[PDB]
Amino acid sequence: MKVGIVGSGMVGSATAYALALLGVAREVVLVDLDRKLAQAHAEDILHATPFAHPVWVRAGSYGDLEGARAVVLAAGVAQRPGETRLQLLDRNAQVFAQVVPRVLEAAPEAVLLVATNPVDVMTQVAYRLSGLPPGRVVGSGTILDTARFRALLAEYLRVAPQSVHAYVLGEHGDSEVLVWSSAQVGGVPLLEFAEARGAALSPEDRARIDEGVRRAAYRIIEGKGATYYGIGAGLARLVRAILTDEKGVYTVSAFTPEVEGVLEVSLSLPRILGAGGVEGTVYPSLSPEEREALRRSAEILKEAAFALGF
Amino acid sequence: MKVGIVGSGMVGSATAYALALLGVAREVVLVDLDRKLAQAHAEDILHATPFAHPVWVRAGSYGDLEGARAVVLAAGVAQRPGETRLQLLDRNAQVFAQVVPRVLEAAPEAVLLVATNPVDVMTQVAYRLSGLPPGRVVGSGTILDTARFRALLAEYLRVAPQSVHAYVLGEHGDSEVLVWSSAQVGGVPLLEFAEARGAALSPEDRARIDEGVRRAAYRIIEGKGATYYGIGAGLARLVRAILTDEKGVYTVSAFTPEVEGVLEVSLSLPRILGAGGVEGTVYPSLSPEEREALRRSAEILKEAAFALGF
Amino acid sequence: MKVGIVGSGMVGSATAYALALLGVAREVVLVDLDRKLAQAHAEDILHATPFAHPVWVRAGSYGDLEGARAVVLAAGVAQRPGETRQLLDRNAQVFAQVVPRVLEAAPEAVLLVATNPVDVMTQVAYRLSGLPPGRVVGSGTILDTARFRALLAEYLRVAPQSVHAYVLGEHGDSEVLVWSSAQVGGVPLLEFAEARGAALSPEDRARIDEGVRRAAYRIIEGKGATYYGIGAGLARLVRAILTDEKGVYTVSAFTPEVEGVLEVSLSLPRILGAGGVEGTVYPSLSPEEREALRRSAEILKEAAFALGF
Amino acid sequence: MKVGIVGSGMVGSATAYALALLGVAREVVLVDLDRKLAQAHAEDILHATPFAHPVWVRAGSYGDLEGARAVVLAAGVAQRPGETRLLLDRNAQVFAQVVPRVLEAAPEAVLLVATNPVDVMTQVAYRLSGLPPGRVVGSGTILDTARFRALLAEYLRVAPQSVHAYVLGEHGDSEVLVWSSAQVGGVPLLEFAEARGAALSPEDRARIDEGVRRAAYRIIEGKGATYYGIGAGLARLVRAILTDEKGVYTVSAFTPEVEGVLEVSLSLPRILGAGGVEGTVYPSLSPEEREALRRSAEILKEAAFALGF
DSSP, X not given: OEXXXXXXXXXXXXXXXXXXXXXXXXXXXXXXXXXXXXXXXHHHHHHHGGGSXXXXXXXXXXXXXXXXXXXXXXXOOOOOSSSOSHHHHHHHHHHHHHHHHHHHHHOTTSEEEEOSSSHHHHHHHHHHHHTOOTTTEEEOTTHHHHHHHHHHHXXXXXXXXXXXXXXXXXOSSTTOEEOOSSOEETTEEHHHHHHHXXXXXXXXXXXXXXXXXXXXXXXXXXXXXXXXXXXXXXXXXXXXXXXXXXOEEEEEEEEEEEETTEEEEEEEEEEEEEBTEEEEEOOOOOOHHHHHHHHHHHHHHHHHTTTXXX | OEEEEEOOSHHHHHHHHXXXXXXXXSEEEEEOSSHHHHHHHHHHHHHHGGGSSOOEEEEXXXXXXXXXXEEEEOOOOOOOTTOOHHHHHHHHHHHHHHHHHHHHHHOTTOXXXXXSSSHHHHHHHHHHHHOOOGGGEEEOTTHHHHHHHHHHHHHHHTSOGGGEEEEEEBOSSTTOEEEEEEEEETTEEHHHHTTSSSSOOOHHHHHHHHHHHHSHHHHHHHHHSOXXXXXXXXXXXXXXXXXXXXXXXXEEEEEEEEETTEEXXXXXXXXXXXXXXXXXXXXXXXXXXXXXXXXXXXXXXXXXXXXXXX | OEEEEEOOSHHHHHHHHHHHXXXXXXXXXXXXXXXXXXXXHHHHHHHHGGGSOOOXXXXXXXXXXXXXXXXXXXXOOOOOTTOSSHHHHHHHHHXXXXXXXXXXXXXXXXXXXXXXXXXXXXXXXXXXHOSOGGGEEEOTTHHHHHHXXXXXXXXXXXXXXXXXXXXXXXXXXXXXXXXXSOEESSSBHHHHHTTTTOOOOHHHHHHHHHHHHTHHHHHHHTTSSOOHHHHHHHHHHHHHHHHTOOEEEEEEEEEEEETTEEEEEEEEEEEEETTEEEEEOOOOOOHHHHHHHHHHHHHHHHHHHHHTO | OEEEEEOOSHHHHHHHHHHHHTTOOSEEEEEOSSHHHHHHXXXXXXXXXXXXXXXXXXXXXXXXXXXXXXXXXXXXXXXXXXXXXXXXXXXXXXXXXXXXXXXXXXXXXXXXXOOSSHHHHHHHHHHHHTSOTTSEEEOTTHHHHHHHHHHHHHHHXXXXXXXXXXXXXXXXXXXXXXXXXXXXXSSBHHHHHHHTSOOOOHHHXXXXXXXXXXXXXXXXXXXXXXXXXXXXXXXXXXXXXXXXOOEEEEEEEEEEEETTEEEEEEEEEEEEETTEEEEEOOOOOOHHHHXXXXXXXXXXXXXXXXXXO
């Protein structure tokens, strides 16, 4: 039960903390070029373990990823003046070019878990770089978005979120697609459910659920500079799924052969997440309207990972 | 966070066990006419707590149910030589008429959790007797049956059961309705997801599974006398949701204004379960054969109750 | 993370349940000659799982014990019309069959002896297994030590997990509550009580002694046997074994010498991990608690010697 | 079951995070002047909660602290023109306004002090609260005690849970270690060591001493401050309070007499409960350890009244 995290910044350390507090893995290994930093986060998290579960948290190099069943790639970040946005992506793809092969040299049988933004394009980058089957490279995707979509719905409907079977699709960016038509609470369609519960989802208060799912990420960044604690626990959950061979269903990003006519693009979709990564993809019922939001999204993403040449 | 269980039999005391090992509630009071049987089970369970979570588990009287936010009714006088089932049934309901008003006097705010068999007719007996709102008396109903249904589907589809969104409605018994038609996994019709995996789900495969959930409770009985560990845990999980104001949907048995033309009847439907009992009930999408099977079930149950005097 | 349990009776099955609700083991195999019995309990405990943790509970043959890292021994037989100490002879008769067959399938496993009386039965299992003594372990006196600390924590207004005091010797009448080396906060027990406005009069001490000894009594009468208790503590001992805890529990195991008494299984504070008990921690007894433990060891030994062990 | 955290810094939020992942609490309220920063931490953490336990996490004014059993006092940073003084100067002018503003909303709460220099800031909190001295509680040397045990455990090959040893006094350079009253499974440490083979060398003790004292060194070197470890430590104290655990933890609290030093606050082994520390235990010592404690104590008193407390 060993997990590696390349990139010992806020996202990766939060993940390590999440893993260690949730007692999911028995060994988390932090790897960063800032071996000093890697070491501080690791030793800090380790000092937490006496007050949680016994998990051996430690910093290392690529060679100590040996045996790790899943390795979280959260190793992007850079400067932000000054330089443009497609230029930050250009230099993060450079890092994957440097980090991917090296991680595969140590943990070839591991599941790659991309967590560097833009999640989806980087996931694409990592898949083609890795030379692995498509189901082994997995991006965080819209798992935090799906949870927010459910959280807002669960608030509006006055029920538990675990009981709101709905999803966010495609991009983890301002082009995601909220699934309403096939959504479901209690065996009844979601839009239908919200009438007996005396609270019809008007196109108004249901387009604000949209720019609430789309804007959640920003209110944080604009408020404290970065986003970490949330994606960290979500990563730790995906890692738990992989480690336990649970075969849960998550809206994570992965290389997709065909989706809405767009070929060879990576985007979120309901995936069965087990010890071999995605074991199967599910294609939810999509109202003719949302299907449009999917391809439009699935085409943005694809023509993104082309400027990059991927 | 205080929990009462009336009827310290197996099912009674196993619910106390699962409650204490899962560390669900902070205080568990066991009440029985056999004062020493309650005092014995509670002493045993308490010796277990230093090897789990800390729970104050004790045996008391009705007054000690004070401030319990939930009381599980699992009486059931033991059948007598020369007494027919029919007589024992009328006799059990007279223990309920003694129990119910007495617990509700100690904990006028408690949610009633009906365990005794038959659970649908006993849930109706409690409701009539409580003078409480309809959602304040819940019976275990079909939880284990919906679990087992989801589990066999999970074993079959190679997917996490938490991901199989399928319910079992109606009587906890031979007229239970496996609803295949609206069942989803990952936002796709259960039946259609079957080809999105191992080539389909035949009406024989389908019958095999039906038998699977139906014959389930009996094999245990025809092996060790009674089932109680499975129920105990399941029971303990509803009391969690109740204690924690979870508002999550379970297939539990409660009193329903109308189902398929049959009026004022207690059977299981997917319901929102929270701090005040069921807080909503979902009427899940049904096919012709399913609607009918539900009605035959709804009427079977109505008559049972009606003959009994409720 | 596989666990065996031979004896799908009330103790063995309670153990299975406790394991499932606590999520230690990933797989729990119940083995009993009443195949339907084992089947029933397993199936029952299976249904409990979706409401706690995923652990595959099943029933099987000695064969299916392959790769178990601990096998709980809770076998035993029917009391039978008019018998007594020869129910005790008949139980050792059972271990004679159980023990080789359990090790034949899972040779690396730690044996967790549960069939009462734990001490005498832990003796016979050890002497049957031919293993190193640390690999045959009795449920022992863990429930009592737990209960000693428990009541102690009420009468002291502190946390059970902060009272370090032990019960030793037999799991029964001759058990030794160790009052001397008992400490809380590192500091000595009766000091701490006298600094908490809670000095323990001897009558207080007696009250708590009875509370530890007759706890079997009071349950047994009003319900028949005990199982819910022992089951969880057994579950916790399996936790330590699977996880290589090297934690200190007062379990029963074969001791070369105890206060001059030779080759007797009683409870001492022991270091439990993946190989069974891997160290003894022998606490400062008083002169009074020492001659006490001697008699405990003396009694257990004659007990075993009478049986042929 | 409501926790408030005044100061949405890294320690403030790491603690909120730990609370929410460990399911300690049903509601955590982050309170900070940088309302938009406290808000951003609340939302980021909220988004974590689908993947762990249902905990409500939100930022709010002091007023939103109502009915919270524990408020965590974690303000400031740790490097501005003057190091004790100032910040410790400017930080107790924050405690000057934060402490009564907090009780104006949650007057029934236990104050958990997280702000450095923790032992002094706890005294400041106590003096400012006008509460029973047991209700203001400093984080103290909980992480140092842990590190002391995790090392002895490592060496002695036993579970840390079973190394009953402590780290007293001022949390920092001069933190005396209870090397002599340390026990393991009842029996005292040095004796238990000869037993497990690993006899406990003088040079051995030295290594582990620096190991405890220089514990944060590499963390601070790598990133300037610690927060993950203490966040979890805080979360563990909050749980002890929220549950009335009455367990024993080496925490800082106003003490009337220590080693001859009048009215001062520093870490000692305490019974932490629903209403803060509800007892204190003098562990046995040594002529070396005692003098160590004493001068360490009066360092603090000649820092506290050297500031008016």
